[PDB]
Amino acid sequence: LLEMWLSEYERVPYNLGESSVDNFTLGELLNLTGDRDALDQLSLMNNDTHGSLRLREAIASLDKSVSPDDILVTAGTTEAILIYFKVRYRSGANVVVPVPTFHVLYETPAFLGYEVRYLQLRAENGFRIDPQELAKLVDDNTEVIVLNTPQNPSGVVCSETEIQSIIEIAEKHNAEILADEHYRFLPHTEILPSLYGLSPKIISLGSTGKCFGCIGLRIGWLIGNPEIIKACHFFKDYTTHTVCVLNDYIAAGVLLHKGKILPRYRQMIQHNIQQFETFIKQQRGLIDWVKPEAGTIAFPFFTDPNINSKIVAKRLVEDHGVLLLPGEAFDRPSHFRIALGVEPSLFQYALEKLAIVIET
Amino acid sequence: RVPYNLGESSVDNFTLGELLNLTGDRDALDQLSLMNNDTHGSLRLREAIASLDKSVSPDDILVTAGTTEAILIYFKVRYRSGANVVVPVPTFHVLYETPAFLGYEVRYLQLRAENGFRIDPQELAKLVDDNTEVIVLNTPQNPSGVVCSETEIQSIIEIAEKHNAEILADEHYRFLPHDQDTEILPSLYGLSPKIISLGSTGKCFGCIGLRIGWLIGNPEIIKACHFFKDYTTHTVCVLNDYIAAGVLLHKGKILPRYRQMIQHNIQQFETFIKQQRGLIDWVKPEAGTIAFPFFTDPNINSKIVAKRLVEDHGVLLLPGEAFDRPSHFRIALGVEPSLFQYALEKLAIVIET
Numbered sequence: 001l002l003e004m005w006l007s008e009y010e011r012v013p014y015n016l017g018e019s020s021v022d023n024f025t026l027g028e029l030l031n032l033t034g035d036r037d038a039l040d041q042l043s044l045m046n047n048d049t050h051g052s053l054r055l056r057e058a059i060a061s062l063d064k065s066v067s068p069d070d071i072l073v074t075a076g077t078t079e080a081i082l083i084y085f086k087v088r089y090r091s092g093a094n095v096v097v098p099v100p101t102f103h104v105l106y107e108t109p110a111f112l113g114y115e116v117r118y119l120q121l122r123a124e125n126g127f128r129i130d131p132q133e134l135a136k137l138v139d140d141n142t143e144v145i146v147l148n149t150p151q152n153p154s155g156v157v158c159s160e161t162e163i164q165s166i167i168e169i170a171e172k173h174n175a176e177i178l179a180d181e182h183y184r185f186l187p188h189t190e191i192l193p194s195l196y197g198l199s200p201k202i203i204s205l206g207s208t209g210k211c212f213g214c215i216g217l218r219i220g221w222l223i224g225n226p227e228i229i230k231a232c233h234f235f236k237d238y239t240t241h242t243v244c245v246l247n248d249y250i251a252a253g254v255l256l257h258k259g260k261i262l263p264r265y266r267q268m269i270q271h272n273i274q275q276f277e278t279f280i281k282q283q284r285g286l287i288d289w290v291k292p293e294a295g296t297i298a299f300p301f302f303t304d305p306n307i308n309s310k311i312v313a314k315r316l317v318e319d320h321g322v323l324l325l326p327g328e329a330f331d332r333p334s335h336f337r338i339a340l341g342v343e344p345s346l347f348q349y350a351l352e353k354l355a356i357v358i359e360t
Numbered sequence: 361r362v363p364y365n366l367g368e369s370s371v372d373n374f375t376l377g378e379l380l381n382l383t384g385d386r387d388a389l390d391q392l393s394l395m396n397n398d399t400h401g402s403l404r405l406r407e408a409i410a411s412l413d414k415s416v417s418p419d420d421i422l423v424t425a426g427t428t429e430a431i432l433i434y435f436k437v438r439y440r441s442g443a444n445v446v447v448p449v450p451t452f453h454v455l456y457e458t459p460a461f462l463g464y465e466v467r468y469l470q471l472r473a474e475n476g477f478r479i480d481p482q483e484l485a486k487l488v489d490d491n492t493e494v495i496v497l498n499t500p501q502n503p504s505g506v507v508c509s510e511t512e513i514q515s516i517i518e519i520a521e522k523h524n525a526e527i528l529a530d531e532h533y534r535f536l537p538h539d540q541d542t543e544i545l546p547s548l549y550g551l552s553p554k555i556i557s558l559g560s561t562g563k564c565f566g567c568i569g570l571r572i573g574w575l576i577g578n579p580e581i582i583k584a585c586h587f588f589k590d591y592t593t594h595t596v597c598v599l600n601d602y603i604a605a606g607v608l609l610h611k612g613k614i615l616p617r618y619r620q621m622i623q624h625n626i627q628q629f630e631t632f633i634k635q636q637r638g639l640i641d642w643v644k645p646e647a648g649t650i651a652f653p654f655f656t657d658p659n660i661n662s663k664i665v666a667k668r669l670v671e672d673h674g675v676l677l678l679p680g681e682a683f684d685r686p687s688h689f690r691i692a693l694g695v696e697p698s699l700f701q702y703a704l705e706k707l708a709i710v711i712e713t
């Protein structure tokens with residue numbers, strides 16, 4: 001459903017249904033990172049099968065708990081999720097996935113034969129993970145606990161105490177924690193710290209794609225102990241083998257020049273959060289949300305349980321060209337996902353047309 | 361990481377600037393948006409691929425991150441319990457290892473140098489069940505260089521269609537025939553509805569690192585592979601996509617240099633065979649970037665000779681034990697002839713001991 005909507009309306013002029021920020025052109029990004037003149041001397045032979053040292057050092061430099069040898073660069077975290085769950089699969093294993101979340105986090109394990117146990121997060125509870133309700137789902141057969149923080153679609157950041165309880169549940173059942181830290185670069189602190197150092201059972205996923213305006217580079221990474229890195233590196237030979245030295249190199253300069261990129265998008269998000277709080281006040285209780293704390297998305301809802309966002313989302317895109325992602329893509333029919341990393345004129349235009357559809 | 365690597369199956373790879381000076385796509389890259397690429401691959405790339413064969417249309421193609429991803433997705437969607445796949449060996453290890461990870465039963469068709477590493481269709485038909493879902497047809501062959509003949513293809517088509525099995529034709533090296541007349545080998549995709557074709561610019565055009573390949577099939581297999589690619593990489597970069605498209609559109613500015621290097625090295629290796637006076641032989645390759653010669657002495661272990669060669673001389677050959685052919689070794693033809701000749705003289709020195 002997430003792919004059904006975002007592909008059918010990929011070319012609409014007012015697209016708020018995606019989770020990436022406004023993407024650069026290659027020339028725009030190179031004017032900020034300064035990596036242009038170095039590209040022509042890059043060899044088109046196979047890249048380092050872990051990713052180049054330049055990229056792994058830039059990733060490792062972000063956290064004192066991370067060293068360059070802990071990192072395996074992948075073609076987005078979509079590949080990293082696939083290889084990680086493949087390596088961890090055994091017969092009779094289950095995984096715990098809080099939902100709403102990115103569909104790949106529970107659909108890939110289902111394809112691989114895992115038993116998938118869902119922890120339904122709810123807006124009434126602030127989309128927060130209750131560790132006593134999480135502890136009900138964790139077996140000795142539970143091998144992976146998915147921890148998407150900042151959350152897609154809600155934007156909720158796990159608190160330090162929530163993390164400590166989840167660490168305790170995982171270590172008790174000897175389960176690993178797959179911490180998808182995609183949106184750590186856009187707090188609403190400069191960046192959120194990685195969870196990789198907090199427990200030996202934590203494996204971290206990261207990427208430049210959503211936060212830096214370069215989703216198309218297809219660069220992600222996995223952080224883990226040497227044994228899980230060796231096992232994932234082995235199986236990546238049967239997925240894509242390597243990523244291109246150019247994508248690798250361009251993403252490295254992005255992280256090394258994050259100060260030229262992330263603040264401008266933070267200001268863009270902060271204005272749009274204000275624009276949506278204005279919209280919530282004007283709607284007088286019809287629209288509410290769990291306020292997001294970090295990332296690129298929000299998951300507001302109609303307070304009337306009868307309204308289907310898909311019906312409102314359909315009329316909005318056909319009559320006005322404005323795309324919102326209906327919450328059915330997350331099994332939350334009253335919610336909808338809205339993109340925060342867009343130009344505020346575009347964000348406000350969408351609210352103005354959404355108001356028109358609400359009236360009529 | 362040794363400096364004199366003849367163990368790879370790619371040709372001498374360009375730098376990005378060297379490749380762009382031949383295709384002319386440099387100035388166009390800066391206006392490309394870093395939003396998601398077309399989830400089928402760009403039209404420019406899919407049209408450039410389709411233009412190579414009259415049987416291929418732009419809508420038949422799914423661009424992937426190398427054929428490694430195409431192999432993974434194709435075998436994944438086709439898997440069912442009790443299925444088997446038939447793999448002629450020696451071949452590229454992914455062609456039988458990925459189906460093994462996915463739960464397929466793998467039936468190996470042993471190819472032999474005595475028979476020229478050619479496919480025996482009557483012995484192949486002994487391996488094909490009603491449970492056989494895929495028949496792997498890597499032509500030109502890695503490592504031998506063998507090109508499947510027109511009659512061999514029709515026999516394989518006959519066995520597959522009789523048992524309702526599909527044919528996975530890994531046509532990676534179709535861009536480097538060794539005969540002077542034809543420029544590139546034709547795609548097998550038009551010959552039967554059971555044929556799914558894999559291609560790539562990587563090994564033949566000196567840009568293996570771009571990670572660009574493609575899969576060709578009927579709309580249901582294209583729709584099914586496109587669906588599962590959402591769980592592998594979703595898309596390939598618009599930049600790599602765009603560069604590979606310009607490579608295909610300017611193949612005439614690229615392939616001739618590699619053709620001359622391969623034939624020059626085949627000639628140098630034929631000279632080396634004459635000097636060795638029967639100790640070295642090979643099935644002469646017909647197309648591609650590699651050869652699979654062997655020692656005629658049953659006592660020589662290529663792994664030992666390859667080991668001494670790389671430690672004392674810095675020259676890497678791929679020992680045939682990697683293909684369960686201990687007397688063989690794989691040597692790269694797409695290197696500079698001066699490097700190819702350096703390797704032969706040093707391999708001769710190692711042979712004298």
Ligand SMILES: Cc1ncc(COP(=O)(O)O)c(/C=N/[C@@H](C[C@H](O)CNC(=N)N)C(=O)O)c1O
Nearest residue numbers: 018019076077078102152182207209220590594
């Ligand atoms: C937390 C989180 N982790 C990982 C990924 C995968 O993104 P990536 O790491 O592979 O770039 C996403 C992707 N969110 C996008 C979908 C992609 O844009 C398209 N679908 C695939 N790429 N499979 C969206 O939800 O709208 C995500 O939100």
Ligand SMILES: [Mg+2]
Nearest residue numbers: 060061063066
């Ligand atoms: Mg560090």
Ligand SMILES: [Mg+2]
Nearest residue numbers: 410413414416
């Ligand atoms: Mg055509």
